[PDB]
Amino acid sequence: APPVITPRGAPFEAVRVARDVLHTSRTAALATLDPVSGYPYTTATNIGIEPDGTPFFFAAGLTLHARNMETDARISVTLAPFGKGDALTLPRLTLVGRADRIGPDEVPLAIARYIARYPKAKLYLSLPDTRLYRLRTEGVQINGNITPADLRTDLSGAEELMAAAESEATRLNAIKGEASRLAVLAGAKTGRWKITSIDPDGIDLASASDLARLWFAERVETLKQFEKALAQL
Amino acid sequence: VAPPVITPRFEAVRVARDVLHTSRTAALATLDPVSGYPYTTATNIGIEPDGTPFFFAAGLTLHARNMETDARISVTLAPFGKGDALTLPRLTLVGRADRIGPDEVPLAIARYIARYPKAKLYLSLPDTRLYRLRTEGVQINGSNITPADLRTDLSGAEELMAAAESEATRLNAIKGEASRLAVLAGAKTGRWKITSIDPDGIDLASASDLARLWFAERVETLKQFEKALAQLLK
């Protein structure tokens, strides 16, 4: 199996900037392959990130990029602060792999997850041609030794936290000012924030315009360990 | 004999030309020579007087490499600063990455720097490569548009084009004038400069934003430009 990115472990530093970009990028460039011309074909879309770290996204069925992906699952995305300043002076995370359509048995949860981050997607996720896809990342490049494995969150020791994750995010979001003080502790501006996802390594938060992630000092596997981590931060 | 570069599935052309002229950041897709997978990056967009997008890539990068091996590329331009991707108009241009020849790099540098002042540094780095998009297919999003629809026709306007550089300089020397034009264009006040004048209008840049002011009618001569400008600035 040739590497999906032809060449021209990674240390904590490199991986952490890569994971920050993964979790705090709203806009993704998406490239697909045209089924007859062989040319690439790009669009831009919103990215969601499943608790295990897997990127996912919406594409309407009537689109050229959806069409392209039905035939050929080979795709690439770039996550970057698109529009925040000179693109060549800012991080660029590229993820190359296969687009897997989220099947009917799994779309309700994927819709839920996507809305948790993007409440305004309410207006397009219950359409006749609504489709969502997961990226199965196969090669990774970051611009300023990283593997697909480097970018995943390991859930395996943490089923108790994950059973409580959604309830806990609801609880915390219902504490006035709580999501925003978490956003600021993460390094974000104070604003209108919501927790969108809790996982063993930290908390993803979203405002109307920005994203943040608060990283735990140490891995959290239980509800009690969660409570302790919050009490430092 | 060659098939459309995009296999087929609000005024399209005007919205498209506006995105074309006012987008800083572009998604760029390239093809991997071995795996056949696409490969994406983000890059900055320059525009030439006829509307042709151009861009720079460091030579020691994967996309630069990919483009050496196979020139077929795609770019998506959007007003990305303005909020979520699925809310924005998104212009996809499919075609070939043509390397800009040696004689034209000095001009392309100055044009690029005008939009991207930090480039003053990273273009001064080894193996800088310069490309323009040869557009072969177009999609606008968020119709049935052709590459020709996006281009600005310079025929008949050689007099204006012979003066366009010194007119930009002239106008940029009138304190506040580029910013007045940018506000007419629908933009926010700031430290604006005219980057380009063409028969159909004027491109402007500030540090955070880009603007395009459209003429009410096509301009071919200096007399016609000055009249058009005087009407506008009333």
Residues 72-91 of A with CB under 8 A from B: 74-78, 80, 82-90
Q: Which of B13, B8, B2 is nearest to B214 (CA)?
A: B13
Distance CA B170, CA A150 (A): 54
For residue A9, the enclosing domain spans: 1-152
The distance of A147 to chain B (nearest Cα, Å) reads 16
Q: Cβ of B94 and A43 within 8 Å?
A: no
Q: Mutate which of A4, A72, A88, A98 to disrupt the B interface (most B C-beta within 10 Å)?
A: A88
Q: What pairs with residue B95 in β-bridges? A: B73, B135
Residues B21 and B65 in one domain: yes
Give residue for tokens 């956003």. A183
Q: Which of B32, B79, B29, B24 is nearest to B53 (CA)?
A: B24
B175, two tokens: 């304190």
Q: Order across the sheet with B201-205: list the strands.
A: B193-198, B201-205, B210-214
- Chain A hits for B73, CB-CB cut-off 8 Å, are 39-40
Backbone φ, ψ for residue B106 (5° rounding): -50, -45
Residues 14-73 of B with CB under 8 A from A: 24-44, 56, 60-62, 65, 72-73
Q: Are the beta carbons of A89 and B43 closer than 8 angstroms? A: no
B51: left (phi over 0), alpha (psi -120 to 50) or beta: left
Residues 6 or more apart whose CB falls under 8 angstroms from that of B173 comprise: none
Residues B15 and B124 in one domain: yes
What's the CATH number where B202 sits?
3.20.180.10
According to the entry, how was the structure determined? X-ray
> What is the domain count for chain A?
2
- Chain A hits for B4, CB-CB cut-off 8 Å, are 37
Distance CA A98, CA A74 (A): 5
Neighbours of A51 (CB within 10 A): 18
Residues B34 and B51 in one domain: yes
Q: Which of A81, A32, A79 is nearest to A55 (CA)?
A: A79
Of B130, B151, B172, the domain-final residue: B151
B78 to chain A: nearest residue by CA? A44
The distance of A227 to chain B (nearest Cα, Å) reads 33
Give residue for tokens 């669009």. A43
Residues A178 and A122 in one domain: no
What spatial distance separates the first Cα and last Cα of chain A, rounded to whole Å?
A: 44
Residues B65 and B119 in one domain: yes
Residues 161-190 of A with CB under 8 A from B: none
Q: Cβ of B6 and A39 within 8 Å?
A: yes
Residues B60 and B172 in one domain: no
Nearest to B9 among A32, A40, A64 (CB): A64
Of A104, A126, A152, the domain-final residue: A152
Residues A224 and A213 in one domain: yes
Distance CA B22, CA B31 (A): 27
B24 to chain A: nearest residue by CA? A83
Q: Enumerate the H helices of chain B as residue ranges.
A: 12-22, 62-69, 105-115, 119-122, 147-150, 158-172, 177-184, 222-232
Q: Mutate which of B1, B5, B25, B55 to disrupt the A interface (most A C-beta within 10 Å)?
A: B25
Interface membership of B118 toward A (CB under 8 Å):
yes
- Chain B hits for A28, CB-CB cut-off 8 Å, are 85
Distance CA B127, CA B56 (A): 10
Nearest to B37 among A26, A74, A118 (CB): A74
Residues A172 and A148 in one domain: no
Residues 6 or more apart whose CB falls under 8 angstroms from that of B58 comprise: B64, B122, B125, B127, B128, B129
- Chain B hits for A2, CB-CB cut-off 8 Å, are 34-35
Q: How many helices (H) and strands (E) does chain B have?
A: 8, 10
Residues B145 and B182 in one domain: no
Interface membership of B7 toward A (CB under 8 Å):
yes
Neighbours of B212 (CB within 10 A): 24
- Chain A hits for B141, CB-CB cut-off 8 Å, are 43
Of A127, A152, A177, the domain-final residue: A152
Residues A207 and A146 in one domain: no
Please tell me what DSSP assigns to residue A12.
Answer: H
Residues A116 and A228 in one domain: no
Residues A49 and A122 in one domain: yes
Query: For chain A, percent helix, then strand, then coil, each to nearest 5?
Result: 35, 25, 40
What's the CATH number where A76 sits?
2.30.110.10
Distance CA B97, CA B76 (A): 14
Backbone φ, ψ for residue B226 (5° rounding): -55, -40
Distance CA A22, CA B175 (A): 43
